[PDB]
Amino acid sequence: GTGKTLLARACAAQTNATFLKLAAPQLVQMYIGEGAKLVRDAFALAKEKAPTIIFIDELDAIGTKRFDSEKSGDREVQRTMLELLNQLDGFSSDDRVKVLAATNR
Amino acid sequence: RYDSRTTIFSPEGRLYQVEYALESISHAGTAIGIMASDGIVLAAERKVTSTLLEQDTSTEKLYKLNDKIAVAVAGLTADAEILINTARIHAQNYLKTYNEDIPVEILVRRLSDIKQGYTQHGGLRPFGVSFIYAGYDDRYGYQLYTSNPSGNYTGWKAISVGANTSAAQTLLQMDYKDDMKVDDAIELALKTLSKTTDSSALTYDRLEFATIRKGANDGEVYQKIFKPQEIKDILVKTGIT
Amino acid sequence: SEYDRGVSTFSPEGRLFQVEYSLEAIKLGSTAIGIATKEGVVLGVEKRATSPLLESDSIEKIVEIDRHIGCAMSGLTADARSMIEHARTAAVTHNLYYDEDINVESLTQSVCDLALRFGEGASGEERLMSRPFGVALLIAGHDADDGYQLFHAEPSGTFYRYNAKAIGSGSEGAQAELLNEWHSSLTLKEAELLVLKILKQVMEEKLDENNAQLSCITKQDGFKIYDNEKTAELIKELKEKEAAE
Amino acid sequence: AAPYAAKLKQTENDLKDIEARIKEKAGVKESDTGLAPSHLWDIMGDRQRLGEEHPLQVARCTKIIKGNGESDETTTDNNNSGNSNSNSNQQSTDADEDDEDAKYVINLKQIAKFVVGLGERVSPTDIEEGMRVGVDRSKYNIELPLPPRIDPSVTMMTVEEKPDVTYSDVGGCKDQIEKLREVVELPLLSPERFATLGIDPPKGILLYGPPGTGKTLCARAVANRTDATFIRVIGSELVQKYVGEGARMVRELFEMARTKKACIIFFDEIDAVGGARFDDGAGGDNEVQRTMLELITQLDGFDPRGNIKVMFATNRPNTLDPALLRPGRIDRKVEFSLPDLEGRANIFRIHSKSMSVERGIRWELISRLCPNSTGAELRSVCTEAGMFAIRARRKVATEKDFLKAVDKVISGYKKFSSTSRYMQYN
Amino acid sequence: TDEFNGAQLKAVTVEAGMIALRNGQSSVKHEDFVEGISEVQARKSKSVSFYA
Amino acid sequence: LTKQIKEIKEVIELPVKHPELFESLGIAQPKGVILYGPPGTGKTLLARAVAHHTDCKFIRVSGAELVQKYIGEGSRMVRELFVMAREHAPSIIFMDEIDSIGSTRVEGSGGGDSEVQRTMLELLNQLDGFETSKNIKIIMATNRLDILDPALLRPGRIDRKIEFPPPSVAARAEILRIHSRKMNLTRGINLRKVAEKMNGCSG
Amino acid sequence: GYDRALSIFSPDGHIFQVEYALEAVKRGTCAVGVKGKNCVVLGCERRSTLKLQDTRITPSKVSKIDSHVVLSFSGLNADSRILIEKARVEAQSHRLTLEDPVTVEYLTRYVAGVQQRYTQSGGVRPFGVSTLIAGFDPRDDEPKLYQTEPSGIYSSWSAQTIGRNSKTVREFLEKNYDRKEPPATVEECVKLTVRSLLEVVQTGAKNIEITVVKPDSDIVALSSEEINQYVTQIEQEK
Amino acid sequence: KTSSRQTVFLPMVGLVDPDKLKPNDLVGVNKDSYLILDTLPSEFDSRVKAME
Amino acid sequence: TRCKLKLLRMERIKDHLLLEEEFVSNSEILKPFEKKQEEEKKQLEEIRGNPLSIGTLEEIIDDDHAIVTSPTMPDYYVSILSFVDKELLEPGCSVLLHHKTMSIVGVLQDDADPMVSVMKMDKSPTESYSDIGGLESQIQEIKESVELPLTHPELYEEMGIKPPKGVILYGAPGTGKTLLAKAVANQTSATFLRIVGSELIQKYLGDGPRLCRQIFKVAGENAPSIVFIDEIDAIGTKRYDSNSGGEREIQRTMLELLNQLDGFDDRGDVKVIMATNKIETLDPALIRPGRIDRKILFENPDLSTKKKILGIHTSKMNLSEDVNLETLVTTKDDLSGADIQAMCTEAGLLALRERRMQVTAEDFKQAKERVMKNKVEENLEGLYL
Ligand SMILES: Nc1ncnc2c1ncn2[C@@H]1O[C@H](COP(=O)(O)OP(=O)(O)OP(=O)(O)O)[C@@H](O)[C@H]1O
Ligand SMILES: Nc1ncnc2c1ncn2[C@@H]1O[C@H](COP(=O)(O)OP(=O)(O)OP(=O)(O)O)[C@@H](O)[C@H]1O
Ligand SMILES: Nc1ncnc2c1ncn2[C@@H]1O[C@H](COP(=O)(O)OP(=O)(O)OP(=O)(O)O)[C@@H](O)[C@H]1O
Ligand SMILES: [Mg+2]
Ligand SMILES: [Mg+2]
Ligand SMILES: [Mg+2]
Ligand SMILES: [Mg+2]
């Protein structure tokens, strides 16, 4: 409720970059195949239509620090979150394809 | 739980503190007091023994609080210490004031009141110590009592507190006869103490003993502690050693 | 919650829920009704028995605080022994100091001063009572200067003057009846039968003098707690009146 | 021992005879299934059974493809997708052309997925996502479409239109009931005022509370008063949710209300189905999460709603998604709570109204003695008092009969703490 | 207010226009906002001094 | 442990050999035994000695049941405890569960506790029965009663509780006697010495 | 949780300590008081546990406050102990100040006042004892039987049972007893008091304890032999 | 991983390329013989919609 | 001797005749008909192959088809055809399918399943009209709720009230709550369902909610009925396992139970009985009052109540002249009714111990001290003294 979402869409639209939304609370699944698969679709899109700002919601459910939460496909989302950061170095640095991210704890 | 303090009761109105304090007495050794027609014998058990431990300087569970009434002790000994002194001081306060020695019932009543008083008010702890009061007063002649750590007293012709309370109680009452000779009172004490106790060889150093008589040295209440060499003999008469 | 474990701890409403709760202790105790008139205040009560072995003729719940100041109570009686004790002392110390009748209003304040005490200390009133009072009083009396007055002394709040007040268990339905049946035209005999009339309505018991007790403050008759015959007579008149109707 | 001994063996043989008697009996039962009007059904019955024409497997679409642009030929194409309408019509270096579209990928109820063609009865406008489709025993291909999911006919039961409930069948004229009126009726009559103020008119409400208050009775009450037709879904009575079955449960009834005007979509008891997900939990479910994702978007889409109001009752607000708790889905929140003295008077008066009892009783008199309570407990005092009354053989339950009934529920409360008080003499 | 985040702040203002609409007004005022706050909380808006 | 040898004979053999006598003379029939006391006392072996003389089934059920799944599940083999006990009656069942689970789940409630609660409780139903008694001699073994769950502990649907003692001087001597024959007999006889010297804490 | 102090109340206005104190009474054995026309008999269940235990040196359940006031109790034995000596002194302090034999009203009101004082306080529990305080006065011939409760509330009742399974004993007493006719003779007062106690003892005619108080400072405690004639008299009529 | 509850190792198909087989691709496998037949699009859910 | 002969006079001749009668009649049924019915049967057997795969009917589409879900993994659109009607079926009923090509060829089941078999019982009740004394009052509360609507519905109509639905028996073990329900059931002559609530639950998933449905479904076909779901505690708030293999099962199964009890209508014609240890082993709200009337708390026999239980036992055992009835009560202190039965079993074993044929004085005295020793506390009088 502190308007991260608000600023972020406002920042994207100013820079002449597209606002890719990655709905972190909707992407929750114990589905191992369908969990891994859908994340990469969202990224691929963002790259193509670059400049872009990806805004990634709550990290309290797609990549918990603690494993005393039962997760098996959100485990696989967590591994894909690293792969995204590596791929922003696909133009040198990360300037063209930038990522903002939000967490509440 | 509602064991946080004395003030607070459970749904059922019992107080856990009292309960713990009863259990404290039975984690220190058996103590047995027998009243007989011809004397009241006190006998107690040593919970401690090391090979280099000495116990010949003092009895750690027997104190005379007055020259006519003495107590055998069951419970934690630091707790015991404070109260032994409070009772003996109160005894002589009676002697100062009335120029005669304290009746048994008053003496017990005073300490259970103090002990209850710690439950009734304040932050102070209850003090789980059970004294077996063996005394003589002209009110009811020989009198053997014990005090509860629940802070009330009951008269007796025998009582056992300390370890194996159930075991000591049935065994004593089975070989009770309304009369009882003071020699048999001694003989009985030793026999029930061996069975209860997990040290197979009951030796004189595992024993504390006093016998209290006005049938010996008439017109005078005389409490006499046995020495080791006397305790050593009686064990051979009971056939332990 | 969490604001009912401190007596110096306020709720996020700014209130004390230790105190709030003591209002429900007042409501728990049995109904008391007072009705002031221009001729005197008539103070009636409810009692309850479970056995007929209860001596109902030697129990107090209307108490004499002076010979012209009386009170009814409702709530915890453990608290009430103390409350009524303080209030006796004040009336007596006034005549000690002054040789003149205490004021009804003045008495009302002093009572509420003892009520304020919830902990210890505090300036200008050294506090010695350790918990919330669980007792309210309907305070009725007479000083000349303000005539006959009825107040309800509220330990939680402070005193509110009433021209008629019901407290206890049956308070909500009584208050409405007492709106429609307090007048500036009440007579003392009529007030007496009025109190019984309201009591019965909210009493799920039997109306009898064994669980009722009228009393008046009339400054010319003194404080008179009534007899069993006297109250019995008022039960009888009540029934003939409402039979015709 | 001759009196009992001899008679013991005799007892025993009879029991054994009885056991044997039951196995003789059950080996023959009542003849057969033969019925003269279904002996004529037998004429058609031989032909179809021997023919290849039943059974049809139940499958259901789970994934839509477009049958060109799919990437079926893979010769000189790239990726997993083509041009999304062509893939073999712009090039014959594949060496093939095909003009098949809307092929669709089904799932069997054995959990095995297959792509199938289309019959002679099928066109792309007879098939959709989530619609049952019948396929062969052997080599598969859609023959006849079956209607979507198992939801139809089961939902209609739960929906009652135009309730026979008003604010006479609800006791108390409670605070929540006064805020409830403002949500449904006030912007329906006049959307002018809301527009001018510059607030967006209330249309979301969440009724929530402890059990037994009667959050539902009110909700029904106003549905009739506003004179709107009533559509009910109960998401803890209706427990179809499997792979977005409950999203089809939601869609139909919302979709139906939307075609009509002057409607109430009451989503009830959504603690499960369209409620909290159990990915986080040990349940592993996210089958109720499809139901959730659909529910949000239906609301959001409908907006401005043309004065058709979406209502919610859920027991706990802890079983809701925080997207619902953003405005434009839910706008008003009412916790139902214990009725006041007179409110409890009123619930007693309705219960008592149905009874045939002595009229000299006064409703206020009984509810005084009663503490603060739920309506469901005051239903219990009247039913209990009825039972005491017949037992004593009165055809009426006196004021006194209801005081005994009140007392027994209370006595139970006393049993769980401690009994006896100071109120036996005060 | 104190410790009201973005979402909450909007909740009181929108709420305060509803309240005003019921009263007979067709515009918001200062007092009505105050009333919006007393929904977030369980405080009574108007109660006599004898506990508050 | 003579006391125990005499009891388990009276309690188990007499109702099975003749049911008529126990019903004529007393009333009802015992539902079993709860054996408790120190571990090491040979409860199990003693009970195996009972099972052999009566000419009864055995089984012996080792621990909690979930473990067998080769056909079905172990939750329903408790249901089948009835079917098996009855057909092959006369049976003794030496049902084990030492209860090193503890007093934690005597109170509990919660956790995965409900399954083992179920296994224990539903076993209980078959014995007392809703008509017919399958077997009257299902037999419980455990180290203490405080660790024992209360449905099972509560008497009158399980009968008889017998406590083994930490062995006497007399008991030690008699246990010592039977094995020393198998061994070698000491010259001068020093079988007397051993029992004097110490009394074990178990058998 | 509001049963942690006497300075915290529940939303119903109770201090559960008092409520749990009433359950504590029930642990202690029953006591029964019944007045007649010219007496009060205060009778009680006594306990005989073992041959070792005595009676001489083993506390009575009746303690005499003075020569014209008597007191019975039920509760924990330790708690009543401090209360009785305390009660006795208060009783003496009446005469010290006023120089008159102790009033029974004065006595029930102060003694429960000690209880009340403790309950009022939040830092200390009060007692868990309910008592009967019965008596006469040399001036007043009216027989009085009073009650205390652990809240520090005193009440007066014609006849009462308190203690262990009191409720059941109560219902029997209601019926026989009338406020219009209490027992005329002393012996008859005793017969009823015994009939009530038979119920709580099960069997035990050494376990029924009778005391009688009449005006002009007459307190007697009945011999074992005398208590026994009633029991046998009640079995012949039974 | 088949939708016939196996996991199987199949010699690679000549028309399908090693470029258009990588982890998590959805694929046709021929029903008559398990050899890798064709390539299917990716499946989507209601969660994906929101992301666009 | 004379009256047990009279039981033999009534039972032997009537019963023995009944076996023999069935046995000839099985032949005799056949002989009246020799065409028509025989013919129709003959062609039913040609049509219906061997074996038949079981089905379960989900739903009927009105056009001479239906959809079944079968223990065969894929579902089927089957047809309704041949010796079956559209209205001879109802949804959710079990149907018989043709092996080769699935078709409903009729029904001979109609809710015939193994869980139905466990649930229905043909057993004799253990108690009949409170054979064993004590709890006189508690049975005159079950009876008001359960037995009384079945026996006379008219009395509730004059009263103008709806008639009760169900009872909840709870509290203490050894008080014979599970046996009072059996007593009440024999008194009416109602249909009794001993199903146990714990017999729906297994490791394997997804089976359970079927079982919950079937209970309410069968109970309504044979209504009037009394349903006893004994031990509904295990399926309470609690969980199967803290790992896996049961996170779902308890949650679905309980919820599904509340639903079809309410969904009948608020009936006073199918009663339920929930037997439970406490409400602390279940969820804090059930389904939750006005609807589940009445709740019966069992507590320990009092001196009157435990006398009554005892008098029954002692008379069926040799002697009572030795030790008075009263002397047994006096010695005992208050306990459940199992403890009273336990003293009598031990007494009988003690007569065996001596090798007597009389329950002597010595036997009574020991048997009383034994039970008290189990089952012991002494800090009630230790706090006090
Ligand atoms: N307002 C009321 N007027 C009359 N009776 C009432 C009222 N509220 C509840 N009751 C009684 O309680 C019964 C059951 O509760 P009801 O269906 O009203 O409650 P709810 O809290 O909406 O429930 P659930 O948790 O079952 O959805 C009603 O059938 C009725 O007899
Ligand atoms: N009374 C005896 N006579 C001879 N041997 C004995 C006796 N009692 C115990 N033993 C021996 O002591 C050993 C330990 O006993 P065992 O393991 O059979 O005990 P348990 O008390 O039934 O155990 P658990 O609690 O593990 O079920 C064995 O070697 C056994 O043979
Ligand atoms: N009113 C009564 N009806 C039936 N038996 C009774 C009655 N009162 C007491 N009993 C006694 O209680 C005994 C114990 O009954 P039982 O052990 O079956 O108890 P339960 O409460 O149903 O138990 P569980 O919790 O073990 O399922 C009966 O055998 C009988 O002696
Ligand atoms: Mg956001
Ligand atoms: Mg509802
Ligand atoms: Mg073993
Ligand atoms: Mg049972």
Side-chain angles (χ1 to χ4, degrees), chain G:
Chain G
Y2 321 86
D3 62 301
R4 299 291 296 181
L6 308 81
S7 47
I8 308 163
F9 281 103
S10 55
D12 312 281
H14 314 327
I15 307 186
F16 297 125
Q17 275 63 82
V18 177
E19 303 296 313
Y20 297 163
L22 211 299
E23 173 75 80
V25 188
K26 305 299 179 164
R27 291 294 174 267
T29 61
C30 206
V32 176
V34 177
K35 298 192 266 183
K37 294 303 299 310
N38 50 79
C39 53
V40 189
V41 187
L42 210 65
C44 34
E45 170 161 49
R46 169 73 189 255
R47 170 73 187 192
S48 288
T49 321
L50 283 190
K51 58 190 190 179
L52 300 311
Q53 206 179 64
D54 302 330
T55 56
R56 290 95 57 183
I57 47 172
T58 292
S60 299
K61 303 292 176 295
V62 55
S63 167
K64 309 93 191 68
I65 296 283
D66 196 358
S67 50
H68 39 64
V69 284
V70 292
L71 182 143
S72 70
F73 54 100
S74 291
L76 317 179
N77 193 41
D79 283 331
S80 205
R81 194 75 68 190
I82 298 162
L83 190 72
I84 286 170
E85 290 174 274
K86 177 83 175 178
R88 286 200 278 203
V89 295
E90 195 67 70
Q92 195 52 92
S93 278
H94 182 292
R95 189 180 202 124
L96 179 56
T97 54
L98 295 178
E99 203 169 87
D100 295 288
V102 190
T103 307
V104 214
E105 172 39 61
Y106 187 90
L107 200 60
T108 200
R109 171 159 71 86
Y110 265 68
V111 163
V114 169
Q115 292 189 115
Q116 190 256 291
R117 187 173 59 180
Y118 302 163
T119 304
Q120 179 71 50
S121 304
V124 308
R125 54 191 212 89
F127 294 114
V129 181
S130 289
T131 75
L132 297 177
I133 297 170
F136 287 86
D137 284 286
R139 283 174 206 95
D140 288 57
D141 306 267
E142 182 170 80
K144 311 184 176 82
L145 174 53
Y146 284 110
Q147 290 77 12
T148 70
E149 290 85 63
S151 200
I153 304 172
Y154 45 106
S155 56
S156 199
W157 292 53
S158 290
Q160 187 58 311
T161 62
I162 51 160
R164 190 198 284 164
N165 289 288
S166 53
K167 278 298 295 319
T168 44
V169 193
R170 192 176 299 171
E171 66 182 298
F172 176 64
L173 175 64
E174 300 180 14
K175 308 178 168 66
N176 301 101
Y177 193 104
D178 286 293
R179 283 195 65 211
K180 172 163 81 187
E181 193 59 48
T185 61
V186 195
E187 184 178 85
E188 183 74 54
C189 198
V190 175
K191 282 184 178 65
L192 167 57
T193 297
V194 182
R195 266 198 312 211
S196 295
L197 281 169
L198 186 60
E199 304 184 271
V200 294
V201 285
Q202 303 293 297
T203 61
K206 297 303 297 311
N207 296 343
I208 299 186
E209 177 168 38
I210 310 300
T211 288
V212 194
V213 51
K214 286 187 265 185
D216 316 296
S217 307
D218 177 288
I219 302 171
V220 277
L222 299 183
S223 307
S224 292
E225 312 311 75
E226 300 163 2
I227 292 160
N228 288 338
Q229 72 183 270
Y230 294 101
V231 167
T232 66
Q233 279 172 17
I234 288 160
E235 304 299 308
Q236 182 194 47
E237 55 173 301
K238 170 172 185 190

Side-chain angles (χ1 to χ4, degrees), chain F residues 10 14 22 25-27 30-31 72-73 79 110-112 114 118 121-122 125 130-131 154-155 160-161, chain I residues 123-124 126 174 182 194 198-199 201 203-204 231 234 239-240 242 318 338 341 345-346 349 352 355 374:
Chain F
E10 286 288 293
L14 320 176
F22 196 116
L25 171 46
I27 184 50
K31 285 86 173 173
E73 188 63 65
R79 301 167 195 179
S114 197
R118 192 194 295 109
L121 191 61
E122 197 167 64
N125 297 11
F130 304 113
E131 196 78 299
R154 192 267 305 153
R160 302 296 189 285
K161 320 188 169 149
Chain I
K123 66 172 165 56
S124 307
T126 306
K182 308 175 86 291
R194 176 53 55 164
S198 313
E199 292 194 286
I201 317 295
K203 185 179 186 196
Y204 314 121
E231 286 161 14
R239 201 172 287 262
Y240 187 85
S242 288
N318 313 116
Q341 212 182 232
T345 320
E346 288 183 347
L349 172 98
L352 300 166
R355 305 287 173 207
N374 288 343

Side-chain angles (χ1 to χ4, degrees), chain F residues 42-45 94 96 98 141:
Chain F
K43 326 182 285 289
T44 313
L45 298 170
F94 188 84
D96 212 281
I98 274 157

Side-chain angles (χ1 to χ4, degrees), chain C residues 123-157:
Chain C
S123 297
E125 162 194 304
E126 168 62 60
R127 305 186 163 188
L128 293 168
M129 314 298 281
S130 299
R131 64 174 180 170
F133 277 78
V135 63
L137 296 184
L138 295 183
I139 306 187
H142 185 273
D143 47 301
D145 199 48
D146 297 265
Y148 292 100
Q149 298 197 280
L150 175 53
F151 289 88
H152 151 68
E154 178 189 6
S156 276

Side-chain angles (χ1 to χ4, degrees), chain C residues 42-44 62 192 195-196 212-216 225-226 231 234:
Chain C
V42 180
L43 290 177
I62 288 177
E192 298 158 43
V195 168
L196 297 171
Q213 185 53 296
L214 301 167
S215 298
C216 66
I225 303 169
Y226 292 2
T231 308
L234 308 159

Side-chain angles (χ1 to χ4, degrees), chain A residues 1 3-6 21 55 57-58 102:
Chain A
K4 292 176 176 71
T5 299
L6 296 176
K21 174 67 70 153
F55 179 60
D57 294 295
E58 317 184 45

Side-chain angles (χ1 to χ4, degrees), chain D residues 7 11 14 21 24 35 38 41-42 49 54 56 58 109 132 211-212 236 282-283 354 356 380 387 395, chain I residues 1 4 15-16 22 26 47 59 73 75-77 83-85 101 144 159-160 247-248 259 288 293:
Chain D
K7 304 212 153 77
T11 334
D14 204 76
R21 184 164 70 237
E24 187 69 41
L35 303 164
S38 299
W41 286 21
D42 301 338
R49 196 165 59 74
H54 41 96
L56 284 179
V58 183
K109 291 293 172 44
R132 306 184 296 198
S236 282
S354 32
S356 298
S380 192
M387 267 186 285
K395 289 293 95 188
Chain I
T1 186
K4 190 47 185 67
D15 286 54
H16 288 51
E22 178 63 41
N26 295 312
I47 289 183
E59 44 169 13
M73 306 185 54
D75 290 14
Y76 300 117
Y77 196 51
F83 295 121
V84 62
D85 312 277
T101 41
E144 305 173 78
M159 181 61 53
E247 309 308 288
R248 296 186 204 197
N259 292 346
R288 175 276 292 127
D293 298 326

